[PDB]
Design a protein around this ligand. Structure first.
Ligand code: AMP
Ligand code: CL
Length: 297
């Protein structure tokens, strides 16, 4: 983990930095410290450690954790969320996968459904797709804004850079408020290359046990790749803060993606210095006494 820990620091997006995904963030790390087999063992320790942290977090009831995932189709997002959940307790973890908004949801501001779904003290909430969709798919297809009664947009011509700027400000305000009121916010962008996306799409199409699930509408979003990259770059450049950071994770090799994310969550949550509750003398005496009754039956 020694070398890996330094590399992980590079994946965080600093507040003042500017973003060029093609040029400066590699979708696949060439100087991988370790073998895939070593990586799998490390990931296994990470999930176990993350599990212990979750238990301490549930037992204290002082903070909540919100973890966000955004990615292009076939970046491994869903599978990564899956792998994390299998390791955790279901009692203090909730996954919400946001999809196209319902009628009721469209009658409220775009943040309302996310605010409603936030994690309570002691629990971890995972957003497999978040409020950031409102500056991503909605920026590429501004026509969706016409179905939002609260957006204030009657024609696509009305939307300019100032509108996305205002949303970035709204989002930053929402995340700063929850950060100041107990929530730890960690955001991950899984960054997959165009080439690798293509290779995964073809693999899915070819497998008779995956292709029932393949949706050809994913191809439409692939054709808007440059539009999405611009949406992603502008968002990362304005919504990553020290309090609520974005991490860009290379997604071309899945085992390495998962390892990176687990390492980063552990490291960030380790700053809370969580411990298990201790047993006091009064509590110790009650336990001994309870044990004495069981023996005397
Ligand atoms: N706020 C939103 N507005 C419009 N579409 C969204 C929003 N949030 C999620 N979606 C879309 O809903 C879909 C989720 O369905 P799936 O990933 O197929 O389960 C993805 O295409 C998202 O981009
Ligand atoms: Cl790119």
């Amino acid at each position: 983990f020694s070398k890996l820990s330094k590399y992980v620091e590079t994946l965080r997006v600093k507040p003042k930095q500017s973003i060029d995904l093609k040029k400066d963030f590699d979708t696949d790390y060439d100087h991988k410290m370790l073998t895939k087999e070593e990586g799998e063992e490390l990931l296994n320790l990470g999930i176990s450690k993350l599990s212990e942290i979750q238990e301490k977090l549930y037992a204290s009831g002082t903070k909540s954790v919100l973890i966000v995932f955004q990615a292009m189709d076939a970046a491994g997002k869903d599978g990564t969320v899956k792998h994390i959940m299998t390791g955790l307790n279901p009692q203090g973890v909730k996954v919400t996968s946001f999809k196209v908004p319902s009628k009721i949801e469209l009658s409220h501001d775009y943040l309302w459904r996310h605010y409603v779904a936030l994690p309570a003290t002691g629990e971890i909430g995972i957003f497999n797709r978040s409020h950031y969709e409102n500056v991503l798919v909605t920026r590429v297809h501004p026509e969706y804004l016409l179905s939002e009664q609260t957006s204030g947009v009657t024609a696509i011509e009305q939307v300019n850079q100032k509108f996305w700027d205002k949303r970035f400000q709204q989002i930053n305000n929402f995340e700063q408020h929850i950060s100041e009121n107990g929530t730890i916010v960690l955001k991950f962008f899984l960054h997959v290359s165009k080439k690798e996306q293509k290779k995964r799409f073809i693999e899915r199409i070819e497998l008779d046990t995956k292709n029932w699930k393949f949706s050809t509408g994913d191809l439409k979003e692939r054709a808007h790749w440059k539009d999405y990259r611009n949406a992603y770059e502008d968002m990362l450049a304005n919504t990553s803060t020290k309090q609520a950071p974005w991490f860009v994770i290379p997604a071309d090799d899945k085992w390495f993606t998962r390892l990176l994310i687990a390492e980063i969550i552990c490291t960030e949550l380790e700053k809370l210095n969580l411990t298990f509750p201790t047993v006091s003398l009064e509590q110790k005496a009650e336990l001994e006494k309870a044990k004495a009754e069981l023996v005397a039956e």
